[model samples]
Target: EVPPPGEIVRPPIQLGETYYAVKNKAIASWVSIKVIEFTESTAINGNTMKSYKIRYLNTPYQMIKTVTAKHIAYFEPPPVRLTIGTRVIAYFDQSAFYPGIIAEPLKQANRYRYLIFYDDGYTQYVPHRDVRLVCQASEKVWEDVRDFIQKYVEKYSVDRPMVQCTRGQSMTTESNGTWLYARVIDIDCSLVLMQFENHTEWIYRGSLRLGPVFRETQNNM
Candidate 1:
């Protein structure tokens, strides 16, 4: 396939999940997809095949078909360390990443030295490898990047018990390009509605997790 001629549609899956797949005779490319229908409803031994209904985010022409996991691949972007005041999304505590700006370097805590001023208007200490530019995080919302990294919030930190996900319980969900602090209002199948600030919508339950909320180190900043 000569890279199908048309304006290439970019990322999201529902919100457009992006994945890399080799195409156009051995050339690897990024394709934005929305998995319309998922199945095992259509497997082998112990490994159930992912017969996902992936329609490439496209114009009138679309590859509305079933594909296995072998057809999908995730690309890992290299790590970056921004200068002071660079806009970023930094992992807050250990639960989720939040929108922020690199404040100043803490020569004392060099291991995770970048201090961050989050978009919600608060500051926290963060590690260089755990931070990403705003635009990069926006492109891969479905990739739980930290799951592949070592998340250190200090070995001698005080005990802060993480809460659980239940109806009328508070939780966190990644929405748009950042984490939204929310309260679970109703449980409807695998997705639920959670309220935060002035927003309300049903989001995938897999993304909702017990949160430590935020740990603001602003008082010292």
Candidate 2:
């Protein structure tokens, strides 16, 4: 199983394509998207092949629709939705990671894991840009966020480490008595990369169940 239908809409979704060709029209004022890379392999402990559903989106800008952990690691792409100029936001990578893995090393000792937020409707047209700082965090989290943010600053000269997000949370669990902290990031930024890692479904255009938030200085970059 994959994300729910309407999560991503395409006329005839092919096996693999450079980019999703969504119609210029039919997109509403908003769209919601959930992204998870489905993969299967042996667990650290050789019992059963442990499945993993690591969500890179971990911010207040988005929400997660729970599914069985079993369903997450081996799921498929969900159906895409097409609405009339539906306003939409997306979260994805600016460029595909070299290895396309969470722990894998990307250029400049940074991994490719990221988050974004942008409008999906045609009311606003955005030029292509690479969103290095997906979301921000507290001064305490700067240690963990530095490696990821520095990659962008070093390459783009974005000083003060500009991050993009209003909410976030951290989770740690001991699987098979082993401890692992899983970070979930969410945002309202939408960006699509051609060669780097890819997101099958990245939309946020529905009822917001998480409630409201107040903020300032929001940019589409």
Candidate 3:
């Protein structure tokens, strides 16, 4: 039911202020609405109504609706202040909620935005109100992988004390759990290239160990 026009008058609401309004057909649940504009309308029931143009949170569509003074209420939600290095949950188009870290703050014409680094390999600058804190960033594991590779290269690089193998030489690698009896062709950066009768392949250096001939030679010595 529309409230009488005289009773609908409300104090001025500021633009961009967060407010709540009755959902279109919901009686028990209210939707958060961001105030965009305010105007008076007599288009409904031949009685002037308090109308507001609003955008719902978590959505991008804008709508206009009439409400009584009693139907509109303001809430003082805790501010969404975040700093660089803070981890958060961000909204994206493809993913509903993604893990992200606050990379930095961007200064827009009038608003402060944050650069969010997502765990799923995406990054973007978002409004301060667009994210919520989740947890702290964890130690990256790739650093350990790179360090292990570097140490392996220093110990047995392809360029130093090269291990040569002839055609039809059998070799086994822990990485693939298979024996390769191919001709060694190229070796670089902890990687090895080999050629068989009709195919060629590349293997990691540490993954490969000495096969029959070299193994027997070392065993005898």
| Ranking of all predicted structures according to TM-score, beginning with the best and ending with the worst | 1, 3, 2
Instruction: Point out the higher-scoring one by TM-score: 1 or 2.
Output: 1
Q: How many clashes show up per model?
A: 5, 44, 0
Cα error, residue 212 of model 3, in Å, equals: 46
Q: Rank by lDDT, descending?
A: 3, 1, 2
Q: Tens digit of lDDT per residue, candidate 2, span 29-96? A: 11222334333466678655322223323346544332222121111222332122121222233322
Task: Flag clash pairs in model 1.
Answer: 12-15, 12-16, 12-17, 13-16, 13-17
What C-alpha lDDT do the candidate models reach, one value each? Answer: 0.45, 0.24, 0.48
Maximum-TM-score candidate: 1
What TM-score does each of the candidates earn?
0.28, 0.15, 0.27
Estimate, for each residue in 1-221, the C-alpha lDDT of model 1 and write its tens digit: 01122322222223245543323221122344565675764224566434566666664776665665444433322233344544455666635555555545434434436766454433456655555443222223223223211121212122323233578877555566577677888654434567874687654343323234332222222
Q: For each candidate, C-alpha RMSD in Å?
A: 19.4, 21.0, 21.7
Error of 2 at 183 (Å): 32
Prediction 1 TM-score vs. true: 0.28
Off by over 4 Å in 3: 1-80, 106-111, 135-221
